[PDB]
Design a protein around this ligand. Structure first.
Ligand SMILES: *[C@@H]1O[C@H](CO)[C@@H](O[C@@H]2O[C@H](CO)[C@@H](O[C@@H]3O[C@H](CO[C@H]4O[C@H](CO)[C@@H](O)[C@H](O)[C@@H]4O)[C@@H](O)[C@H](O[C@H]4O[C@H](CO)[C@@H](O)[C@H](O)[C@@H]4O[C@H]4O[C@H](CO)[C@@H](O)[C@H](O)[C@@H]4O)[C@@H]3O)[C@H](O)[C@H]2NC(C)=O)[C@H](O)[C@H]1NC(C)=O
Ligand SMILES: *[C@@H]1O[C@H](CO)[C@@H](O[C@@H]2O[C@H](CO)[C@@H](O)[C@H](O)[C@H]2NC(C)=O)[C@H](O)[C@H]1NC(C)=O
Ligand SMILES: OC[C@H]1O[C@@](CO)(O[C@H]2O[C@H](CO)[C@@H](O)[C@H](O)[C@H]2O)[C@@H](O)[C@@H]1O
Ligand SMILES: *[C@@H]1O[C@H](CO)[C@@H](O)[C@H](O)[C@H]1NC(C)=O
Ligand code: NA
Ligand SMILES: [Zn+2]
Ligand SMILES: [Zn+2]
Ligand SMILES: [Zn+2]
Ligand SMILES: [Zn+2]
Length: 535
């Protein structure tokens, strides 16, 4: 019996899953590889597992693609990325562990380029293409995760590798004119002092105005103003951060926009349980897709007990916000195909102070729900306390029991009949400590009351949303048994959490809208779809 296995998120039939690997589209087929343990529910014996799709939702298995079978990767096949060469040919750059336990960079390419599912991959010699040594002095124990490579205006390829030198994180950048002979640049594309190791780095352009994706090597088209994103997975904090800036192709550096620092004080893709993010360019739809690894919030005991660990968020479409300050994400449209044609709809319903509204007629552990909340009188929101800068510390300081002028209001997902178990995703609104009348919208994902099992990770997640509370506040949540993916302000803030209820399972879960704030807020619209299982 498996109450926590997802009905429609990507996870292997069994065992431990980890980083998403070399995602790509080839011959109109979507590919996903991933770090897999073929014989355990913990990390180990790590190989590139492999599934394919035509819609990014239903995945067909294939035997592992990249596994230890040569000096350059004999002690493991760590993370990496697929580049698609200008002639449509796809290649994987991945980190392998050698006889000396050194992290080195290997190329792998398909052996049958006419196989539409690219089942078997051949590797060099002359692998490794990139390795630490005495001359470059790269930390052999911290040199992993090559990105998708991009082609410069000087016919030379660039690729970065996450690394660190003495508690300074950097994107070690290599150049190559043939994709076979790679040479280290004197200086990295970017670095941050005091940040740890830089894992799973990503580097890609975005249009300044538009929802569409940009091919990874593009400079034009003239005219069209581009912006560049550098994303890192910060090993110490265990979060993925990105910064928006410009790519000086002359110096071959990355320059973060004024109002950013790549270490710590940066925006996250996701303010909950989300790690080792990776994007690819979906040439089929001209969109950039972001893959993300949500690991397990239960005990390791539980993981080995259920015999699997780790899921993948449903893929996000990602693009720049109009104001240029952050990225927007939104679950790929395809996932909406999983919705039943029946749809529970509630409109213009008032939530008085301290109220809640059950929403029936849905499979409440496997569902998609979208709400529009309208605030009646913004002059009623409490002025935000002076030293409240961390949105995670606000949500954890004040639970749904503590009441604000406006908020807490939102959804209670994965909830038991009598509410002993519930996961609350919600908003609070404040007036800011500014001379201009600006409001601060808080999004929380509180899971302290989430499950009766006590040794689950009940960490509460939190985020600010850049939306105007004059217009109605939008909240979506994908609910899938042991995962909720909350989206605030139409993708302006995303929180993934992991939840393991003992009561709120299958038949026995709701599903509430609620409001415990001082002022009564209006539910403008509520759509709830039951969700069919994938694959
Ligand atoms: C893969 O999966 C695992 C598990 O899900 C995950 O590790 C967990 O990460 C979370 C954070 O994401 C950790 O949550 C913290 O837990 C500590 C306590 O943990 C200790 O004790 C437990 C045993 O019960 C052990 O598991 C663990 O090893 C530790 O010894 C909390 O204290 C933290 O809460 C504080 O900080 C939060 C903000 O970050 C606030 O929300 C909260 O209010 C707390 O602040 C309080 O103390 C502050 C002083 O430090 C003070 O400023 C405040 O006033 C306040 O009182 C936090 O909940 C969790 O412990 C991890 N668990 C394990 C098993 O390691 C991995 O990260 C994940 N990996 C990936 C790649 O995603
Ligand atoms: C090279 O990287 C390795 C691995 O991160 C470093 O050795 C680790 O340092 C940490 C933190 O001080 C300690 O837990 C251990 O001493 C090592 N742990 C691991 C995970 O191996 C080493 O310090 C780095 N050296 C340089 C020159 O950057
Ligand atoms: O599977 C290895 C792959 O995962 C990452 C990030 O998730 O590193 C994790 O696994 C390593 C193997 O034990 C650890 O050294 C590291 O601390 C952990 O975050 C990638 O860096 C790596 O390619
Ligand atoms: C490669 O793919 C083609 C087309 O699917 C297939 O017919 C062929 O047998 C495969 N292998 C070789 C060695 O050509
Ligand atoms: Na889409
Ligand atoms: Zn040194
Ligand atoms: Zn943190
Ligand atoms: Zn920086
Ligand atoms: Zn006003």
């Amino acid at each position: 019996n498996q109450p926590y296995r997802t009905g429609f998120h990507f996870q292997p039939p069994k065992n431990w899953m980890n980083d998403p690997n070399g995602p790509m589209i080839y011959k109109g087929i979507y590919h996903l590889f991933y770090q897999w343990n073929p014989k355990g529910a913990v990390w180990g014996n790590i190989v590139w597992a492999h599934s394919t799709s035509t819609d990014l939702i239903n995945w067909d298995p294939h035997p592992p693609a990249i596994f230890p079978s040569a000096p350059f990767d004999i002690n493991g096949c760590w993370s990496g990325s697929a580049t698609i060469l200008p002639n449509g040919k796809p290649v994987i750059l991945y980190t392998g562990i050698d006889p000396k336990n050194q992290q080195v960079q290997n190329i792998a390419e398909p052996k049958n380029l006419s196989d539409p599912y690219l089942r078997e991959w051949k590797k060099s010699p002359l692998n490794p293409l990139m390795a630490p040594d005495a001359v470059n002095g790269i930390n052999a124990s911290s040199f992993r995760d090559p990105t998708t490579a991009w082609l410069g205006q000087d016919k030379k390829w660039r690729v970065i590798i996450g690394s660190k030198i003495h508690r300074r994180g950097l994107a070690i950048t290599y150049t190559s004119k043939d994709f076979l002979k790679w040479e280290k640049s004197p200086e990295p594309l970017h670095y941050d002092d005091g940040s740890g190791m830089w894992e799973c780095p990503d580097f890609f352009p975005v249009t300044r105005f538009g929802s569409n994706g940009v091919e990874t090597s593009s400079f034009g088209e003239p005219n069209e103003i581009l912006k560049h994103v550098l994303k890192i997975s910060l090993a110490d904090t265990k979060h993925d951060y990105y910064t928006i800036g410009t790519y000086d192709r002359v110096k071959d550096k990355f320059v973060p926009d004024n109002g950013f620092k790549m270490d710590g004080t940066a925006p996250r893709y996701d303010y909950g349980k989300y790690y080792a993010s990776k994007t690819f360019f979906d040439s089929a739809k001209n969109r950039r897709i972001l893959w993300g690894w949500t690991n397990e919030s239960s005990s390791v005991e539980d993981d080995v007990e259920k015999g699997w660990s780790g899921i993948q968020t449903i893929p996000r479409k990602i693009w720049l916000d109009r104001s240029g300050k952050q990225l927007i994400q939104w679950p790929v449209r395809e996932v909406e195909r999983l919705r039943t044609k029946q749809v529970k709809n509630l409109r213009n319903k008032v939530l008085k102070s301290g109220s809640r509204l059950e929403v029936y007629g849905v499979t409440a552990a496997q569902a998609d729900v979208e709400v529009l909340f309208k605030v009646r009188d913004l002059e009623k929101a409490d002025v935000i306390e002076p030293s409240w800068t961390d949105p995670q510390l606000i949500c954890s300081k004040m639970n749904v029991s503590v009441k604000s002028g406006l908020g807490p209001f939102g959804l209670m997902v994965l909830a038991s009949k009598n509410l002993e178990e519930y996961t609350s995703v919600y908003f609070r609104i404040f007036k800011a400590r500014q001379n201009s009348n600006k409001y601060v919208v808080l999004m929380c994902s509180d899971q302290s009351r989430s499950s009766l099992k006590e040794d689950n990770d009940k960490t509460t997640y939190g985020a600010f949303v850049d939306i105007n509370p004059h217009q109605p506040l939008s909240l979506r949540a994908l609910i899938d048994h042991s995962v909720v993916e909350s989206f605030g302000g139409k993708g302006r803030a995303c929180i993934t959490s992991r939840v393991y209820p003992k009561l709120a399972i299958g038949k026995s879960s709701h599903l509430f809208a609620f409001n415990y704030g001082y002022q009564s807020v209006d539910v403008l619209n509520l759509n709830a779809w039951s969700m069919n299982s994938a694959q």
